[PDB]
């Protein structure tokens, strides 16, 4: 669990990590409520870190990828979002991997 604050570290500070430093705010997303069932964000996985939340580094990883699971699903993959969420899952797959 310390590669799990340090890897979260790197993405929150990350330059494309904007659109998911928060809770997507469906208020103000139209149809974001009906298509993504299981939200994340980093913000998120940061309470449940720091609550002492997460039995597995593998629980982290999945909540993780949720995030950029849902970024696809949502956003096209040439619009700005799309785009920040591949930089970010590349980077948290790569960072990831050569730790474990
Ligand atoms: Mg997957």
Same mark, same amino acid.
């Given at each position: 669990?310390? $590669?799990?604050?340090?890897?979260?570290?790197?993405?929150?500070?990350?330059?494309?990590?904007?659109?998911?430093?928060?809770?997507?705010?469906? *208020?103000?997303? @139209?149809?974001?409520?009906?298509?993504? !069932?299981?939200?994340?964000? &980093?913000?998120?996985?940061?309470? *449940?870190?720091?609550?002492?939340?997460?039995? @597995? @580094?593998?629980? =982290?990883?999945?909540?993780?990828?949720?995030? &950029?699971?849902?970024?696809?699903?949502?956003?096209?993959?040439?619009?700005?979002?799309? !785009?920040?969420?591949?930089?970010?899952?590349? =980077? &948290?797959?790569?960072?990831?991997?050569? $730790?474990?």
């Amino acid at each position: 669990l310390t $590669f799990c604050e340090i890897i979260l570290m790197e993405m929150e500070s990350h330059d494309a990590a904007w659109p998911f430093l928060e809770p997507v705010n469906p *208020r103000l997303v @139209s149809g974001y409520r009906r298509i993504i !069932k299981n939200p994340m964000d &980093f913000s998120t996985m940061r309470e *449940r870190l720091l609550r002492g939340g997460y039995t @597995s @580094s593998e629980e =982290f990883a999945a909540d993780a990828l949720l995030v &950029f699971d849902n970024c696809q699903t949502f956003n096209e993959d040439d619009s700005e979002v799309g !785009k920040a969420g591949h930089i970010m899952r590349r =980077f &948290f797959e790569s960072r990831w991997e050569e $730790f474990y």
